[PDB]
Amino acid sequence: LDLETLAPYIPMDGEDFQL
Amino acid sequence: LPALKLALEYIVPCMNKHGICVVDDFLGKETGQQIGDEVRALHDTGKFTDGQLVSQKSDSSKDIRGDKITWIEGKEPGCETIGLLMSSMDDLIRHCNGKLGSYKINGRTKAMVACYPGNGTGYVRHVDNPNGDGRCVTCIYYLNKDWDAKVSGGILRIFPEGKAQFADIEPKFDRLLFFWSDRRNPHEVQPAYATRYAITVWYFDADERARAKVKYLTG
Ligand SMILES: O=C(O)CCC(=O)C(=O)O
Ligand SMILES: [Cl-]
Ligand SMILES: [Cl-]
Ligand SMILES: [Fe+3]
Ligand SMILES: [Mg+2]
Ligand SMILES: [Mg+2]
Ligand SMILES: [Mg+2]
């Protein structure tokens, strides 16, 4: 079973915050 | 509480020994209630939409996770206390630089404000980041003032790898939780029978997140 099919979505480009 | 001591003397050793760390009474009652009012206002004004998964195939998302969410940057009008929560989480993480495993934490997601609207909704057992998408630390703040988990359910059960007992986290008001996001911590949100709210950010490891972005940008 592909665990990515259960994992919570996050945006993959354009939306990361830099600390 | 002062970030340096909380980070170095509690969060860091807890995370490196157990991969899970609970900080109760994180912001105090006044701020915790202001966060709850801001979340309830997002709910009341129709901002939440069905929670989604990293990869979708034939199944309905609602057979996997029953919550409804919105993403918050922290500067939006009416979200100022959520933004203070995020700044407070970020302050702890910056004080942990280079001491949480071998990670180099440089960034994070927006905040996921999430609601399980009672009715037995929950989240099946899963790993937050099973395939190297960059997430190394899951940080969750709970804001449910009168929650009685014995009747309303909604317990986050984590199954930390290598341990003789699982970790049951009630979604207690003003509780802050950290855990490793990778396969060391499979977890489930057990069915909730009252409206349950939590706010999550995920912190990124720089090198893993760069590899994940390269994969996405090359197809
Ligand atoms: O709300 C919680 O306790 C956990 C939520 C969760 O596991 C998720 O959204 O990935
Ligand atoms: Cl560990
Ligand atoms: Cl770091
Ligand atoms: Fe999760
Ligand atoms: Mg909004
Ligand atoms: Mg949104
Ligand atoms: Mg129950």
Rg (CA), chain B: 17
For this PDB entry, the determination method is X-ray
Contact at CB, B127 and A7, closer than 8 angstroms: yes
Give the position of tokens 């899963």.
B126
Angle, vertex CA B183, rays to CA B180 and CA B185, nearest 5: 50
Nearest Cα residue to atom 8 of ligand 1? A8
Give the position of tokens 């991969």.
B19
3 state SS of A17: strand
- How many CB atoms are closer than 10 A to CB B161? 11
Ligand 1 atom closest to the Cα of residue B51 is 9
| Residue A14 forms contact with B (CB below 8 Å) | no
| Residue B75 forms contact with A (CB below 8 Å) | no
Give the position of tokens 């702890």.
B92
Domains defined for chain B, CATH in brackets: 2-218 (2.60.120.620)
